Design an enzyme around this catalytic site. Structure first.
Site, PDB file in Angstrom:
ATOM      1  N   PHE A 187      70.221  52.651   0.582  1.00 27.44           N
ATOM      2  CA  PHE A 187      70.832  51.243   0.936  1.00 27.44           C
ATOM      3  C   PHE A 187      71.024  51.111   2.208  1.00 27.44           C
ATOM      4  CE2 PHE A 187      71.313  47.725  -2.481  1.00 27.44           C
ATOM      5  CZ  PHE A 187      71.548  46.759  -1.272  1.00 27.44           C
ATOM      6  N   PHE A 211      63.530  44.430   0.536  1.00 26.04           N
ATOM      7  CA  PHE A 211      64.658  43.730   1.319  1.00 26.04           C
ATOM      8  C   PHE A 211      64.810  42.442   1.047  1.00 26.04           C
ATOM      9  CE2 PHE A 211      64.255  47.135   4.891  1.00 26.04           C
ATOM     10  CZ  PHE A 211      62.947  47.577   4.746  1.00 26.04           C
TER      11      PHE A 211
HETATM   12  C1  LIG Z   1      63.126  55.143   9.147  1.00 24.44           C
HETATM   13  O1  LIG Z   1      64.198  54.889   9.487  1.00 24.44           O
HETATM   14  C2  LIG Z   1      65.079  53.887   9.369  1.00 24.44           C
HETATM   15  C3  LIG Z   1      64.825  52.966   8.438  1.00 24.44           C
HETATM   16  C4  LIG Z   1      65.589  51.846   8.224  1.00 24.44           C
HETATM   17  C5  LIG Z   1      66.915  51.849   8.816  1.00 24.44           C
HETATM   18  C6  LIG Z   1      67.169  52.744   9.750  1.00 24.44           C
HETATM   19  O2  LIG Z   1      68.029  52.849  10.748  1.00 24.44           O
HETATM   20  C7  LIG Z   1      68.996  51.619  10.594  1.00 24.44           C
HETATM   21  C8  LIG Z   1      66.171  53.874  10.204  1.00 24.44           C
HETATM   22  O3  LIG Z   1      66.604  54.795  11.067  1.00 24.44           O
HETATM   23  C9  LIG Z   1      66.811  54.462  12.396  1.00 24.44           C
HETATM   24  C10 LIG Z   1      65.518  53.861  13.042  1.00 24.44           C
HETATM   25  C11 LIG Z   1      65.682  52.296  13.466  1.00 24.44           C
HETATM   26  O4  LIG Z   1      64.356  51.852  13.145  1.00 24.44           O
HETATM   27  C12 LIG Z   1      63.915  51.229  11.765  1.00 24.44           C
HETATM   28  C13 LIG Z   1      62.711  50.831  11.512  1.00 24.44           C
HETATM   29  C14 LIG Z   1      61.886  51.971  11.596  1.00 24.44           C
HETATM   30  O5  LIG Z   1      62.708  50.033  10.345  1.00 24.44           O
HETATM   31  C15 LIG Z   1      61.901  49.459   9.901  1.00 24.44           C
HETATM   32  O6  LIG Z   1      60.859  49.398  10.163  1.00 24.44           O
HETATM   33  C16 LIG Z   1      62.455  48.700   8.535  1.00 24.44           C
HETATM   34  C17 LIG Z   1      62.590  47.227   8.907  1.00 24.44           C
HETATM   35  C18 LIG Z   1      63.772  46.981   9.783  1.00 24.44           C
HETATM   36  C19 LIG Z   1      65.099  47.321   9.214  1.00 24.44           C
HETATM   37  C20 LIG Z   1      65.149  48.902   8.815  1.00 24.44           C
HETATM   38  N1  LIG Z   1      63.893  49.323   8.102  1.00 24.44           N
HETATM   39  C21 LIG Z   1      63.846  50.476   7.407  1.00 24.44           C
HETATM   40  O7  LIG Z   1      62.892  50.781   6.801  1.00 24.44           O
HETATM   41  C22 LIG Z   1      65.073  51.107   7.035  1.00 24.44           C
HETATM   42  C23 LIG Z   1      65.286  51.589   5.671  1.00 24.44           C
HETATM   43  C24 LIG Z   1      65.489  50.167   4.513  1.00 24.44           C
HETATM   44  C25 LIG Z   1      65.434  51.093   3.139  1.00 24.44           C
HETATM   45  C26 LIG Z   1      66.558  51.880   2.887  1.00 24.44           C
HETATM   46  C27 LIG Z   1      66.552  52.851   4.124  1.00 24.44           C
HETATM   47  C28 LIG Z   1      66.527  52.373   5.412  1.00 24.44           C
END
Ligand code: A1I5Y
Length: 128
Positions: free
Chosen positions: A55, A118
């Protein structure tokens, strides 16, 4: 819950019509500009694995999540889905692995072949 509702009732906003990115509008936004590729985009979001098992929230960082649209900063499904939103809109997205982290995943946060959910609020966007 929200992920199942999106499966059943979400619009397929993919070009390919492969149900890779499913959307429901939950609160209608304003204007009729939507972000163009290159735009600086400002959102709040809550996200998780479909499975409920990890989450994540912008609120956890105490600050809006900011990214340039279509600049490979976020998963393909965000570039696709945020582009359809209006300022002030809240939407739900359900995303197949092909529009997210694929069969490679992104351990330890994201496993192989993961479906993601999301809730996104579009706060603002500004031209490069
Ligand atoms: C795969 O690594 C992460 C994924 C998320 C959150 C993370 O950190 C807050 C994260 O690691 C740090 C990298 C920051 O870059 C996020 C980018 C790749 O993320 C995305 O493209 C997407 C859309 C923008 C919001 C963050 N999204 C994520 O996929 C999160 C996921 C959401 C599902 C639950 C686990 C984290």
């Amino acid at each position: 819950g929200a992920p199942a509702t999106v499966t059943e009732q979400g619009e397929d906003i993919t070009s390919k019509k492969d149900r890779g990115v499913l959307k429901i509008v939950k609160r209608v936004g304003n204007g009729e500009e939507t972000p163009m590729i290159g735009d600086k985009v400002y959102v709040h979001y809550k996200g998780k694995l479909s499975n409920g098992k990890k989450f994540d929230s912008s609120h956890d960082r105490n600050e809006p999540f900011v990214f340039s649209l279509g600049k490979g900063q976020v998963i393909k499904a965000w570039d696709i889905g945020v582009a359809t939103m209006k300022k002030g809109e809240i939407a739900h997205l359900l995303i197949k692995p092909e529009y997210a982290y694929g069969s490679a995943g992104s351990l330890p946060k994201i496993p192989s072949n993961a479906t993601l959910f999301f809730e996104i609020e579009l706060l603002d966007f500004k031209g490069e």
